[PDB]
Amino acid sequence: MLPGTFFEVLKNKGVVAIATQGEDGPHLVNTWNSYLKVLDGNRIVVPVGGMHKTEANVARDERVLMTLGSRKVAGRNGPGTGFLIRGSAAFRTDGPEFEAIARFKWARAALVITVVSAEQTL
Amino acid sequence: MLPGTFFEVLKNKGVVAIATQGEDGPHLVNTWNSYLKVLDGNRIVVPVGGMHKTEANVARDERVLMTLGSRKVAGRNGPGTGFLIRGSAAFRTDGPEFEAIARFKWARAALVITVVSAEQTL
Numbered sequence: 001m002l003p004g005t006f007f008e009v010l011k012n013k014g015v016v017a018i019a020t021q022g023e024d025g026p027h028l029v030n031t032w033n034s035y036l037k038v039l040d041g042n043r044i045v046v047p048v049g050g051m052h053k054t055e056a057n058v059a060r061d062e063r064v065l066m067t068l069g070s071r072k073v074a075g076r077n078g079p080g081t082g083f084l085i086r087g088s089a090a091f092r093t094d095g096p097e098f099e100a101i102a103r104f105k106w107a108r109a110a111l112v113i114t115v116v117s118a119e120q121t122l
Numbered sequence: 123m124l125p126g127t128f129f130e131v132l133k134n135k136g137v138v139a140i141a142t143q144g145e146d147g148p149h150l151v152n153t154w155n156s157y158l159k160v161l162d163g164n165r166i167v168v169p170v171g172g173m174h175k176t177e178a179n180v181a182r183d184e185r186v187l188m189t190l191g192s193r194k195v196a197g198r199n200g201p202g203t204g205f206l207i208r209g210s211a212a213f214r215t216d217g218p219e220f221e222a223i224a225r226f227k228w229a230r231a232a233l234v235i236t237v238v239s240a241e242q243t244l
């Protein structure tokens with residue numbers, strides 16, 4: 001399950017980064033800390049406006065990496081912390097996962113990350 | 123020439139993300155907005171403490187992606203913006219490139235990103 005300090009990071013503002021595998025190299029896109037919706041102990045849902053290249057990548061290789069953090073949350077050995085999340089991704093345009101982020105009217109889809117690991121890297 | 127909005131983001135707090143190509147998929151690591159040092163029109167230096175896997179990746183494939191942003195800086199459609207940087211990476215342990223981040227007493231090296239493109243993605 002996702003750890004307590006991760007939820008503390010979500011309560012603070014910041015830029016989330018999401019890396020996928022493309023045909024010719026990695027691709028890297030963003031969301032905001034505040035936009036992540038956690039379901040159960042292992043699903044993180046992201047509202048999708050663009051992410052067209054990201055979606056194409058995920059369709060061929062479901063594996064994603066995600067990082068996020070905050071200066072305002074104590075880490076393992078000082079002020080500030082962050083996490084590296086590894087998981088499998090899928091895009092949804094309806095159902096409970098889309099409904100989880102449907103408050104964002106600009107969302108054309110939901111990016112659903114099923115987390116396999118969460119490492120506190122700072 | 124990095125744009126003024128990019129410099130504004132650097133004046134605000136946040137988590138920077140750096141993606142490299144690994145042997146089995148992408149790799150994704152972090153620094154802080156305030157740690158970045160801009161050398162000139164297109165070089166950004168990051169203090170390196172860990173980044174051992176990142177360094178190994180860069181030796182195989184110099185191409186890197188970097189994202190950063192801030193809720194506090196104006197984007198195209200209201201508050202909040204960020205950037206995708208595409209370029210090539212190198213590691214240095216001396217010279218002006220290292221001196222640029224030498225204030226970080228823990229730095230084992232400097233990661234120098236030569237920027238090919240900077241895109242405001244919000």
Ligand SMILES: Cc1cc2nc3c(=O)[nH]c(=O)nc-3n(C[C@H](O)[C@H](O)[C@H](O)COP(=O)(O)O)c2cc1C
Nearest residue numbers: 029030031048049050051052053054191204243244
């Ligand atoms: C700080 C920040 C937050 C962003 N938030 C989102 C978001 O929540 N959803 C989204 O689809 N794109 C968001 N974007 C834009 C994406 O990072 C990306 O540029 C866009 O979705 C296109 O993705 P693609 O290159 O995979 O086509 C954000 C960008 C930044 C800098």
Ligand SMILES: Cc1cc2nc3c(=O)[nH]c(=O)nc-3n(C[C@H](O)[C@H](O)[C@H](O)COP(=O)(O)O)c2cc1C
Nearest residue numbers: 069082121122151152153170171172173174175176
């Ligand atoms: C918010 C945040 C800031 C970080 N800042 C640095 C940094 O400035 N330099 C560094 O080497 N590692 C930093 N780290 C740790 C790296 O992201 C990474 O986990 C570590 O360097 C190992 O890199 P590697 O997986 O390439 O071996 C930071 C981590 C977080 C979450």
Ligand SMILES: [Cl-]
Nearest residue numbers: 013014033034
């Ligand atoms: Cl946020």
Ligand SMILES: [Cl-]
Nearest residue numbers: 135136155156
């Ligand atoms: Cl910062």
